[PDB]
Amino acid sequence: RPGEPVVGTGASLSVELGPRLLTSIYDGIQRPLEVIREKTGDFIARGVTAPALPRDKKWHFIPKAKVGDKVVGGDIIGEVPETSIIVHKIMVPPGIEGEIVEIAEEGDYTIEEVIAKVKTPSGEIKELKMYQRWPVRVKRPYKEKLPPEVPLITGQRVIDTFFPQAKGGTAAIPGPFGAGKTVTQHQLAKWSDAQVVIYIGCGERGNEMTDVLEEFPKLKDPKTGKPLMERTVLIANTSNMPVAAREASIYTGITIAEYFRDMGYDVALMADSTSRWAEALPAYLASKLAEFYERAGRVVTLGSDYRVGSVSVIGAVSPPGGDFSEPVVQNTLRVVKVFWALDADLARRRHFPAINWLTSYSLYVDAVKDWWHKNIDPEWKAMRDKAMALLQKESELQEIVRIVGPDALPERERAILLVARMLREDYLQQDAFDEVDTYCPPEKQVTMMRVLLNFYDKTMEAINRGVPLEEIAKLPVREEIGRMKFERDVSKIRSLIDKTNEQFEELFKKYGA
């Protein structure tokens, strides 16, 4: 990328945006694999480079606008089928508006070709290609940042239910590298309802780059059968790369996320490069994490059609050995709205995903409940809250029992522990390796939860009738409850409610009431 030595604020550090970015692997900056990296500074940056998009590749343009049409920035003037998954939407660059005096015909083109001309109100004729440039450090503009509402549906029960992410929200995952972060990040990347993923996947393990070039091209997008790379764009930070570029990769990544957002996609920006992101010569250097995160959001995009896209941020905080106290841990956890706390004791106990349901939190619960209530069910919030109360109850009881023992525990309390344990095992625990349980649709989540909480209501009902707890604990329907996560037919899961009720009736019959 040649550029120019301009005054102001650096060279004018930017990125190219157009067809073929997808399936591609880039560096703090935007050059293909194993390419030298430029220095930084508050004042300026110097870069010796290669090309970011092939000028030599031929793309099938489908125009969507005509000679005579009025346009504004964000308006979509045609389409380019880019991968087998993603249509690339060709948009007037921000700040350009006017009349389309000239537009290409449906045909094949390389990116330097001019596919349209726009006459601005001044009369100035602006020439538009299939790509555009943007300064990575300026947030691409939009009409309006919408308040957090709809959830980013992850298909993971513990997250979607107890610690929800909003489309356009900010989330962090910290804890040990040990058990499960990788598989959990991988589950999020492939299952979350974001059409496009930008992964800043950046050498935290010496063989990570090897795994990236060797494995990533084989991964399938479970929604289509096709490769996950065909909706992904990677941004590597490594130990050989300049402190400079490593710094700037988040911007390059978020800029590219905003660009797919602007077309109306939901996009997930995933950062898993904690350590490589380090600097030498702090408050002065922390509002630089703040504003990066401020760039997350669901927005009504620029353009003449009403159009919504989003960028959801999920940041890894994996500090090596135990850098968990001071850097990226004071400023970052108080800026993110959601935190999924991976916990090595849970992992050792083989509870997966190993997410600690007492130290994680989401501040999007009330923001997303209405979306759940309107479509998934009307009792979604009441039910999570009830299931959490019972988990909080369990945790208190277990502390108490650690001190004084279990033998003087009353039936009611034993019942609470039995049901909480069913919550942990049936719902909290989810099998990423199983062909059904690797994804749990919204409808299935609420039904499994109703089955569980109905069993709780009947348990507490039975006990307050003199049915003993040992009899409840061996209801056959219990063990079907432990398997419901493996059932793909949601209506079979649902039938467990009536089945539970009936077995209880016939425990009421044995005994009294």
Side-chain angles (χ1 to χ4, degrees):
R1 323 176 342 176
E4 269 285 309
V6 177
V7 179
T9 357
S12 88
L13 206 224
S14 95
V15 148
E16 311 194 338
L17 299 167
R20 204 285 194 159
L21 275 146
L22 284 187
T23 75
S24 140
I25 306 112
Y26 299 100
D27 51 80
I29 285 38
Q30 196 198 187
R31 20 171 173 61
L33 54 259
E34 302 235 13
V35 273
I36 177 263
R37 349 262 351 253
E38 61 53 33
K39 232 248 178 192
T40 284
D42 72 61
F43 37 79
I44 291 93
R46 179 228 208 299
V48 184
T49 314
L53 291 63
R55 312 299 185 161
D56 50 79
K57 181 156 181 59
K58 272 200 172 222
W59 302 105
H60 182 81
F61 190 76
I62 302 176
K64 292 288 173 139
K66 65 192 164 58
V67 167
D69 283 337
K70 294 317 294 245
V71 301
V72 292
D75 265 332
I76 288 170
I77 56 177
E79 295 166 345
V80 169
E82 170 176 6
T83 66
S84 39
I85 295 156
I86 297 303
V87 178
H88 202 280
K89 300 297 197 138
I90 323 295
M91 296 174 309
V92 180
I96 296 192
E97 73 177 39
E99 181 183 38
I100 287 159
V101 294
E102 201 155 310
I103 192 175
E105 285 186 308
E106 183 171 358
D108 300 318
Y109 310 96
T110 75
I111 61 178
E112 300 288 13
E113 306 194 62
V114 164
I115 31 76
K117 299 189 201 174
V118 168
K119 173 191 297 146
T120 77
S122 234
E124 200 157 2
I125 301 266
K126 285 290 167 64
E127 312 173 287
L128 314 187
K129 306 162 159 166
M130 292 182 312
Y131 75 95
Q132 73 177 254
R133 289 182 183 85
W134 193 269
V136 301
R137 282 197 162 63
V138 194
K139 75 195 221 165
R140 309 200 59 242
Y142 47 85
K143 285 187 194 162
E144 198 203 324
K145 175 108 75 197
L146 296 171
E149 180 179 1
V150 177
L152 180 64
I153 293 306
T154 261
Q156 304 292 115
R157 277 185 305 269
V158 59
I159 291 173
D160 289 345
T161 307
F162 298 105
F163 315 109
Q165 161 74 303
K167 293 178 164 90
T170 52
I173 112 269
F177 251 105
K181 173 223 50 75
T182 295
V183 331
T184 295
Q185 282 201 29
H186 197 89
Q187 286 292 83
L188 292 158
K190 14 192 278 64
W191 282 116
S192 291
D193 59 337
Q195 287 78 219
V196 170
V197 176
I198 310 310
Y199 182 87
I200 298 175
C202 11
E204 306 294 288
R205 320 182 227 233
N207 65 108
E208 202 148 42
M209 190 58 228
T210 319
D211 268 289
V212 165
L213 182 66
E214 284 270 53
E215 313 300 340
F216 263 109
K218 310 137 110 163
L219 316 165
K220 306 298 187 193
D221 170 46
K223 322 188 190 148
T224 51
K226 300 148 186 186
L228 208 43
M229 236 50 212
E230 286 187 16
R231 53 209 234 134
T232 306
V233 164
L234 290 172
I235 280 108
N237 299 341
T238 58
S239 213
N240 221 165
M241 290 162 174
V243 63
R246 284 129 115 246
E247 186 258 11
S249 51
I250 70 182
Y251 305 109
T252 293
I254 210 158
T255 297
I256 302 187
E258 289 168 354
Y259 171 74
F260 286 102
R261 165 204 80 182
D262 295 347
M263 328 172 183
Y265 283 119
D266 291 306
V267 6
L269 179 80
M270 307 188 47
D272 180 0
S273 180
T274 326
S275 50
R276 303 315 153 238
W277 177 51
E279 163 70 331
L281 183 267
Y284 300 118
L285 281 96
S287 72
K288 93 100 48 47
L289 202 50
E291 84 322 353
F292 149 85
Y293 274 120
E294 236 287 350
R295 285 175 65 163
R298 198 164 71 118
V299 303
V300 181
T301 69
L302 304 178
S304 297
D305 54 307
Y306 179 87
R307 193 155 92 220
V308 176
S310 58
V311 171
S312 311
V313 183
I314 305 147
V317 287
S318 308
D323 183 64
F324 206 105
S325 307
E326 56 285 305
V328 85
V329 272
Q330 301 300 0
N331 329 285
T332 298
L333 265 129
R334 60 192 281 283
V335 165
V336 310
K337 295 304 180 156
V338 182
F339 175 73
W340 306 314
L342 295 333
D343 187 304
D345 205 82
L346 237 25
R348 280 173 228 127
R349 299 164 47 101
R350 296 251 147 70
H351 178 291
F352 302 106
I355 288 172
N356 184 321
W357 61 91
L358 267 5
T359 57
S360 300
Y361 67 80
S362 174
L363 295 181
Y364 297 129
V365 179
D366 284 305
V368 305
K369 69 193 172 188
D370 191 63
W371 186 90
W372 285 88
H373 293 330
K374 177 142 44 181
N375 339 73
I376 304 333
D377 191 306
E379 286 287 280
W380 174 83
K381 175 84 158 58
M383 295 185 153
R384 46 114 46 235
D385 283 358
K386 187 167 174 178
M388 180 57 76
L390 160 55
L391 294 167
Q392 300 284 339
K393 174 66 195 219
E394 173 190 46
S395 165
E396 187 192 83
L397 276 168
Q398 281 167 345
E399 218 347 60
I400 292 170
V401 157
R402 205 187 51 74
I403 297 154
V404 305
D407 290 309
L409 226 34
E411 287 280 270
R412 167 183 172 104
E413 311 288 343
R414 297 170 74 236
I416 283 161
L417 290 170
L418 198 263
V419 184
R421 171 178 185 178
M422 296 163 68
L423 268 175
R424 287 162 29 235
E425 294 178 350
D426 313 348
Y427 205 93
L428 260 54
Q429 291 176 206
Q430 187 162 167
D431 186 344
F433 300 88
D434 176 76
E435 97 183 8
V436 177
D437 197 43
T438 184
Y439 180 75
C440 194
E443 188 210 347
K444 187 183 167 165
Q445 299 183 37
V446 298
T447 309
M448 282 174 63
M449 175 65 74
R450 310 186 69 116
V451 161
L452 286 157
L453 296 178
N454 192 61
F455 189 96
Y456 171 85
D457 298 334
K458 299 297 188 311
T459 296
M460 297 315 276
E461 180 171 335
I463 270 194
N464 97 136
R465 311 241 289 214
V467 175
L469 190 61
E470 273 89 20
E471 207 61 283
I472 297 165
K474 47 196 145 192
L475 280 192
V477 75
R478 266 193 72 201
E479 78 83 37
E480 301 181 73
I481 300 183
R483 285 179 295 96
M484 71 192 169
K485 61 180 86 162
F486 301 116
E487 177 55 51
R488 98 199 70 209
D489 188 327
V490 175
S491 65
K492 291 190 182 161
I493 300 183
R494 206 170 286 114
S495 67
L496 301 174
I497 293 162
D498 290 325
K499 186 149 187 207
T500 298
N501 286 344
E502 289 159 358
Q503 311 197 345
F504 273 97
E505 254 343 294
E506 70 172 86
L507 221 56
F508 289 161
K509 319 174 304 288
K510 190 171 158 136
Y511 305 104

mmCIF file with all atom_site columns, all heavy atoms in Angstrom, residues 379-394:
data_model
loop_
_atom_site.group_PDB
_atom_site.id
_atom_site.type_symbol
_atom_site.label_atom_id
_atom_site.label_alt_id
_atom_site.label_comp_id
_atom_site.label_asym_id
_atom_site.label_entity_id
_atom_site.label_seq_id
_atom_site.pdbx_PDB_ins_code
_atom_site.Cartn_x
_atom_site.Cartn_y
_atom_site.Cartn_z
_atom_site.occupancy
_atom_site.B_iso_or_equiv
_atom_site.pdbx_formal_charge
_atom_site.auth_seq_id
_atom_site.auth_comp_id
_atom_site.auth_asym_id
_atom_site.auth_atom_id
_atom_site.pdbx_PDB_model_num
ATOM 1   N N   . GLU A 1 379 ? -42.499 -16.555 29.994 1.00 0.00 ? 379 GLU A N   1
ATOM 2   C CA  . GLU A 1 379 ? -42.003 -16.704 31.365 1.00 0.00 ? 379 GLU A CA  1
ATOM 3   C C   . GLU A 1 379 ? -40.482 -16.809 31.507 1.00 0.00 ? 379 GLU A C   1
ATOM 4   O O   . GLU A 1 379 ? -39.949 -17.139 32.593 1.00 0.00 ? 379 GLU A O   1
ATOM 5   C CB  . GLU A 1 379 ? -42.808 -17.783 32.089 1.00 0.00 ? 379 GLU A CB  1
ATOM 6   C CG  . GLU A 1 379 ? -44.234 -17.238 32.436 1.00 0.00 ? 379 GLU A CG  1
ATOM 7   C CD  . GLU A 1 379 ? -44.179 -16.181 33.629 1.00 0.00 ? 379 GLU A CD  1
ATOM 8   O OE1 . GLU A 1 379 ? -44.103 -16.665 34.814 1.00 0.00 ? 379 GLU A OE1 1
ATOM 9   O OE2 . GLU A 1 379 ? -44.200 -14.903 33.418 1.00 0.00 ? 379 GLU A OE2 1
ATOM 10  N N   . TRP A 1 380 ? -39.789 -16.480 30.425 1.00 0.00 ? 380 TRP A N   1
ATOM 11  C CA  . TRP A 1 380 ? -38.345 -16.655 30.358 1.00 0.00 ? 380 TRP A CA  1
ATOM 12  C C   . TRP A 1 380 ? -37.625 -16.021 31.544 1.00 0.00 ? 380 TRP A C   1
ATOM 13  O O   . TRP A 1 380 ? -36.864 -16.697 32.207 1.00 0.00 ? 380 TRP A O   1
ATOM 14  C CB  . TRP A 1 380 ? -37.782 -16.096 29.027 1.00 0.00 ? 380 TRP A CB  1
ATOM 15  C CG  . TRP A 1 380 ? -36.286 -16.131 28.963 1.00 0.00 ? 380 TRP A CG  1
ATOM 16  C CD1 . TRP A 1 380 ? -35.480 -17.216 28.599 1.00 0.00 ? 380 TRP A CD1 1
ATOM 17  C CD2 . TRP A 1 380 ? -35.373 -15.055 29.293 1.00 0.00 ? 380 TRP A CD2 1
ATOM 18  N NE1 . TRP A 1 380 ? -34.160 -16.857 28.684 1.00 0.00 ? 380 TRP A NE1 1
ATOM 19  C CE2 . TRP A 1 380 ? -34.051 -15.545 29.075 1.00 0.00 ? 380 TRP A CE2 1
ATOM 20  C CE3 . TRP A 1 380 ? -35.538 -13.722 29.728 1.00 0.00 ? 380 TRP A CE3 1
ATOM 21  C CZ2 . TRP A 1 380 ? -32.916 -14.749 29.279 1.00 0.00 ? 380 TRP A CZ2 1
ATOM 22  C CZ3 . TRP A 1 380 ? -34.388 -12.930 29.948 1.00 0.00 ? 380 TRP A CZ3 1
ATOM 23  C CH2 . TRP A 1 380 ? -33.103 -13.446 29.704 1.00 0.00 ? 380 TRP A CH2 1
ATOM 24  N N   . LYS A 1 381 ? -37.893 -14.746 31.827 1.00 0.00 ? 381 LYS A N   1
ATOM 25  C CA  . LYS A 1 381 ? -37.247 -14.029 32.953 1.00 0.00 ? 381 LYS A CA  1
ATOM 26  C C   . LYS A 1 381 ? -37.621 -14.564 34.351 1.00 0.00 ? 381 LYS A C   1
ATOM 27  O O   . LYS A 1 381 ? -36.766 -14.831 35.203 1.00 0.00 ? 381 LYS A O   1
ATOM 28  C CB  . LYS A 1 381 ? -37.510 -12.511 32.833 1.00 0.00 ? 381 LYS A CB  1
ATOM 29  C CG  . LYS A 1 381 ? -37.004 -11.634 33.995 1.00 0.00 ? 381 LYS A CG  1
ATOM 30  C CD  . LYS A 1 381 ? -35.597 -11.269 33.861 1.00 0.00 ? 381 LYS A CD  1
ATOM 31  C CE  . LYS A 1 381 ? -35.294 -10.009 34.669 1.00 0.00 ? 381 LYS A CE  1
ATOM 32  N NZ  . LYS A 1 381 ? -35.612 -10.149 36.092 1.00 0.00 ? 381 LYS A NZ  1
ATOM 33  N N   . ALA A 1 382 ? -38.899 -14.770 34.571 1.00 0.00 ? 382 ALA A N   1
ATOM 34  C CA  . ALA A 1 382 ? -39.370 -15.347 35.833 1.00 0.00 ? 382 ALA A CA  1
ATOM 35  C C   . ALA A 1 382 ? -38.677 -16.664 36.056 1.00 0.00 ? 382 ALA A C   1
ATOM 36  O O   . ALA A 1 382 ? -38.182 -16.946 37.172 1.00 0.00 ? 382 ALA A O   1
ATOM 37  C CB  . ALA A 1 382 ? -40.917 -15.509 35.815 1.00 0.00 ? 382 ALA A CB  1
ATOM 38  N N   . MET A 1 383 ? -38.587 -17.461 34.986 1.00 0.00 ? 383 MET A N   1
ATOM 39  C CA  . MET A 1 383 ? -37.904 -18.759 35.113 1.00 0.00 ? 383 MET A CA  1
ATOM 40  C C   . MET A 1 383 ? -36.402 -18.666 35.347 1.00 0.00 ? 383 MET A C   1
ATOM 41  O O   . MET A 1 383 ? -35.919 -19.417 36.204 1.00 0.00 ? 383 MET A O   1
ATOM 42  C CB  . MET A 1 383 ? -38.190 -19.719 33.948 1.00 0.00 ? 383 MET A CB  1
ATOM 43  C CG  . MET A 1 383 ? -39.633 -20.194 33.792 1.00 0.00 ? 383 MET A CG  1
ATOM 44  S SD  . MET A 1 383 ? -39.783 -21.455 32.448 1.00 0.00 ? 383 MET A SD  1
ATOM 45  C CE  . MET A 1 383 ? -41.186 -22.257 33.105 1.00 0.00 ? 383 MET A CE  1
ATOM 46  N N   . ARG A 1 384 ? -35.645 -17.850 34.600 1.00 0.00 ? 384 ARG A N   1
ATOM 47  C CA  . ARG A 1 384 ? -34.225 -17.717 34.967 1.00 0.00 ? 384 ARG A CA  1
ATOM 48  C C   . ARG A 1 384 ? -34.024 -17.276 36.378 1.00 0.00 ? 384 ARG A C   1
ATOM 49  O O   . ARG A 1 384 ? -33.165 -17.865 37.070 1.00 0.00 ? 384 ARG A O   1
ATOM 50  C CB  . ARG A 1 384 ? -33.223 -16.939 34.044 1.00 0.00 ? 384 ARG A CB  1
ATOM 51  C CG  . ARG A 1 384 ? -33.491 -15.658 33.452 1.00 0.00 ? 384 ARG A CG  1
ATOM 52  C CD  . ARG A 1 384 ? -32.625 -14.454 33.929 1.00 0.00 ? 384 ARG A CD  1
ATOM 53  N NE  . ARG A 1 384 ? -31.154 -14.461 34.094 1.00 0.00 ? 384 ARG A NE  1
ATOM 54  C CZ  . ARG A 1 384 ? -30.599 -14.124 35.263 1.00 0.00 ? 384 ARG A CZ  1
ATOM 55  N NH1 . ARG A 1 384 ? -31.395 -13.865 36.275 1.00 0.00 ? 384 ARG A NH1 1
ATOM 56  N NH2 . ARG A 1 384 ? -29.294 -14.061 35.452 1.00 0.00 ? 384 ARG A NH2 1
ATOM 57  N N   . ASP A 1 385 ? -34.815 -16.298 36.806 1.00 0.00 ? 385 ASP A N   1
ATOM 58  C CA  . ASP A 1 385 ? -34.657 -15.686 38.129 1.00 0.00 ? 385 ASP A CA  1
ATOM 59  C C   . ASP A 1 385 ? -34.912 -16.760 39.161 1.00 0.00 ? 385 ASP A C   1
ATOM 60  O O   . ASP A 1 385 ? -34.173 -16.915 40.104 1.00 0.00 ? 385 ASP A O   1
ATOM 61  C CB  . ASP A 1 385 ? -35.664 -14.514 38.327 1.00 0.00 ? 385 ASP A CB  1
ATOM 62  C CG  . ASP A 1 385 ? -35.244 -13.243 37.612 1.00 0.00 ? 385 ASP A CG  1
ATOM 63  O OD1 . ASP A 1 385 ? -34.139 -13.213 36.980 1.00 0.00 ? 385 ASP A OD1 1
ATOM 64  O OD2 . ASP A 1 385 ? -36.042 -12.284 37.626 1.00 0.00 ? 385 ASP A OD2 1
ATOM 65  N N   . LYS A 1 386 ? -35.951 -17.540 38.958 1.00 0.00 ? 386 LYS A N   1
ATOM 66  C CA  . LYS A 1 386 ? -36.219 -18.633 39.883 1.00 0.00 ? 386 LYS A CA  1
ATOM 67  C C   . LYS A 1 386 ? -35.061 -19.673 39.895 1.00 0.00 ? 386 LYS A C   1
ATOM 68  O O   . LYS A 1 386 ? -34.689 -20.183 40.966 1.00 0.00 ? 386 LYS A O   1
ATOM 69  C CB  . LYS A 1 386 ? -37.507 -19.297 39.455 1.00 0.00 ? 386 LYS A CB  1
ATOM 70  C CG  . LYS A 1 386 ? -38.039 -20.370 40.400 1.00 0.00 ? 386 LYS A CG  1
ATOM 71  C CD  . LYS A 1 386 ? -39.528 -20.714 40.003 1.00 0.00 ? 386 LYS A CD  1
ATOM 72  C CE  . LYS A 1 386 ? -40.032 -21.878 40.824 1.00 0.00 ? 386 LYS A CE  1
ATOM 73  N NZ  . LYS A 1 386 ? -41.450 -22.147 40.476 1.00 0.00 ? 386 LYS A NZ  1
ATOM 74  N N   . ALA A 1 387 ? -34.494 -19.990 38.727 1.00 0.00 ? 387 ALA A N   1
ATOM 75  C CA  . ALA A 1 387 ? -33.444 -20.984 38.689 1.00 0.00 ? 387 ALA A CA  1
ATOM 76  C C   . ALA A 1 387 ? -32.162 -20.444 39.308 1.00 0.00 ? 387 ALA A C   1
ATOM 77  O O   . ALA A 1 387 ? -31.461 -21.154 40.000 1.00 0.00 ? 387 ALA A O   1
ATOM 78  C CB  . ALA A 1 387 ? -33.224 -21.524 37.202 1.00 0.00 ? 387 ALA A CB  1
ATOM 79  N N   . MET A 1 388 ? -31.906 -19.152 39.146 1.00 0.00 ? 388 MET A N   1
ATOM 80  C CA  . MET A 1 388 ? -30.762 -18.538 39.795 1.00 0.00 ? 388 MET A CA  1
ATOM 81  C C   . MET A 1 388 ? -30.934 -18.518 41.337 1.00 0.00 ? 388 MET A C   1
ATOM 82  O O   . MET A 1 388 ? -29.980 -18.812 42.093 1.00 0.00 ? 388 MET A O   1
ATOM 83  C CB  . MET A 1 388 ? -30.463 -17.130 39.193 1.00 0.00 ? 388 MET A CB  1
ATOM 84  C CG  . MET A 1 388 ? -29.245 -16.429 39.850 1.00 0.00 ? 388 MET A CG  1
ATOM 85  S SD  . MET A 1 388 ? -27.718 -17.417 39.748 1.00 0.00 ? 388 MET A SD  1
ATOM 86  C CE  . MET A 1 388 ? -27.384 -17.095 38.003 1.00 0.00 ? 388 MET A CE  1
ATOM 87  N N   . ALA A 1 389 ? -32.142 -18.223 41.791 1.00 0.00 ? 389 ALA A N   1
ATOM 88  C CA  . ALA A 1 389 ? -32.430 -18.138 43.272 1.00 0.00 ? 389 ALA A CA  1
ATOM 89  C C   . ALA A 1 389 ? -32.102 -19.468 43.914 1.00 0.00 ? 389 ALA A C   1
ATOM 90  O O   . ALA A 1 389 ? -31.457 -19.566 44.962 1.00 0.00 ? 389 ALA A O   1
ATOM 91  C CB  . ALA A 1 389 ? -33.885 -17.777 43.543 1.00 0.00 ? 389 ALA A CB  1
ATOM 92  N N   . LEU A 1 390 ? -32.454 -20.503 43.197 1.00 0.00 ? 390 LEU A N   1
ATOM 93  C CA  . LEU A 1 390 ? -32.209 -21.836 43.671 1.00 0.00 ? 390 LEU A CA  1
ATOM 94  C C   . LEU A 1 390 ? -30.740 -22.232 43.658 1.00 0.00 ? 390 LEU A C   1
ATOM 95  O O   . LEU A 1 390 ? -30.274 -22.910 44.590 1.00 0.00 ? 390 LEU A O   1
ATOM 96  C CB  . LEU A 1 390 ? -33.071 -22.747 42.815 1.00 0.00 ? 390 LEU A CB  1
ATOM 97  C CG  . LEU A 1 390 ? -32.856 -24.203 42.651 1.00 0.00 ? 390 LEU A CG  1
ATOM 98  C CD1 . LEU A 1 390 ? -32.820 -24.927 43.995 1.00 0.00 ? 390 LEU A CD1 1
ATOM 99  C CD2 . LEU A 1 390 ? -34.178 -24.459 41.888 1.00 0.00 ? 390 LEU A CD2 1
ATOM 100 N N   . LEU A 1 391 ? -30.003 -21.786 42.632 1.00 0.00 ? 391 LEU A N   1
ATOM 101 C CA  . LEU A 1 391 ? -28.557 -21.920 42.617 1.00 0.00 ? 391 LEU A CA  1
ATOM 102 C C   . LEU A 1 391 ? -27.871 -21.099 43.744 1.00 0.00 ? 391 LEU A C   1
ATOM 103 O O   . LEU A 1 391 ? -26.896 -21.530 44.275 1.00 0.00 ? 391 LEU A O   1
ATOM 104 C CB  . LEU A 1 391 ? -27.930 -21.617 41.215 1.00 0.00 ? 391 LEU A CB  1
ATOM 105 C CG  . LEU A 1 391 ? -28.263 -22.574 40.041 1.00 0.00 ? 391 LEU A CG  1
ATOM 106 C CD1 . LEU A 1 391 ? -27.870 -22.025 38.628 1.00 0.00 ? 391 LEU A CD1 1
ATOM 107 C CD2 . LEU A 1 391 ? -27.669 -23.988 40.174 1.00 0.00 ? 391 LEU A CD2 1
ATOM 108 N N   . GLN A 1 392 ? -28.362 -19.911 44.050 1.00 0.00 ? 392 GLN A N   1
ATOM 109 C CA  . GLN A 1 392 ? -27.804 -19.088 45.128 1.00 0.00 ? 392 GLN A CA  1
ATOM 110 C C   . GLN A 1 392 ? -28.114 -19.800 46.435 1.00 0.00 ? 392 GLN A C   1
ATOM 111 O O   . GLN A 1 392 ? -27.262 -19.884 47.317 1.00 0.00 ? 392 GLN A O   1
ATOM 112 C CB  . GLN A 1 392 ? -28.426 -17.680 45.131 1.00 0.00 ? 392 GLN A CB  1
ATOM 113 C CG  . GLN A 1 392 ? -28.238 -16.815 43.845 1.00 0.00 ? 392 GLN A CG  1
ATOM 114 C CD  . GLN A 1 392 ? -26.831 -16.184 43.661 1.00 0.00 ? 392 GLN A CD  1
ATOM 115 O OE1 . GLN A 1 392 ? -26.046 -16.020 44.640 1.00 0.00 ? 392 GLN A OE1 1
ATOM 116 N NE2 . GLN A 1 392 ? -26.515 -15.785 42.401 1.00 0.00 ? 392 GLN A NE2 1
ATOM 117 N N   . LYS A 1 393 ? -29.335 -20.355 46.536 1.00 0.00 ? 393 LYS A N   1
ATOM 118 C CA  . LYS A 1 393 ? -29.721 -21.088 47.730 1.00 0.00 ? 393 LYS A CA  1
ATOM 119 C C   . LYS A 1 393 ? -28.791 -22.270 47.912 1.00 0.00 ? 393 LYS A C   1
ATOM 120 O O   . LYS A 1 393 ? -28.146 -22.436 48.972 1.00 0.00 ? 393 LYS A O   1
ATOM 121 C CB  . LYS A 1 393 ? -31.202 -21.476 47.689 1.00 0.00 ? 393 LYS A CB  1
ATOM 122 C CG  . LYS A 1 393 ? -31.634 -22.367 48.836 1.00 0.00 ? 393 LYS A CG  1
ATOM 123 C CD  . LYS A 1 393 ? -31.566 -21.664 50.231 1.00 0.00 ? 393 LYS A CD  1
ATOM 124 C CE  . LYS A 1 393 ? -31.648 -22.740 51.338 1.00 0.00 ? 393 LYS A CE  1
ATOM 125 N NZ  . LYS A 1 393 ? -32.452 -22.392 52.543 1.00 0.00 ? 393 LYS A NZ  1
ATOM 126 N N   . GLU A 1 394 ? -28.648 -23.079 46.878 1.00 0.00 ? 394 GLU A N   1
ATOM 127 C CA  . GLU A 1 394 ? -27.714 -24.203 46.956 1.00 0.00 ? 394 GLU A CA  1
ATOM 128 C C   . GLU A 1 394 ? -26.333 -23.824 47.468 1.00 0.00 ? 394 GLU A C   1
ATOM 129 O O   . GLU A 1 394 ? -25.750 -24.543 48.264 1.00 0.00 ? 394 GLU A O   1
ATOM 130 C CB  . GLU A 1 394 ? -27.550 -24.917 45.586 1.00 0.00 ? 394 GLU A CB  1
ATOM 131 C CG  . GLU A 1 394 ? -26.443 -26.008 45.579 1.00 0.00 ? 394 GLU A CG  1
ATOM 132 C CD  . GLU A 1 394 ? -26.143 -26.510 44.162 1.00 0.00 ? 394 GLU A CD  1
ATOM 133 O OE1 . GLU A 1 394 ? -25.986 -25.683 43.199 1.00 0.00 ? 394 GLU A OE1 1
ATOM 134 O OE2 . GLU A 1 394 ? -26.091 -27.729 43.994 1.00 0.00 ? 394 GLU A OE2 1
#
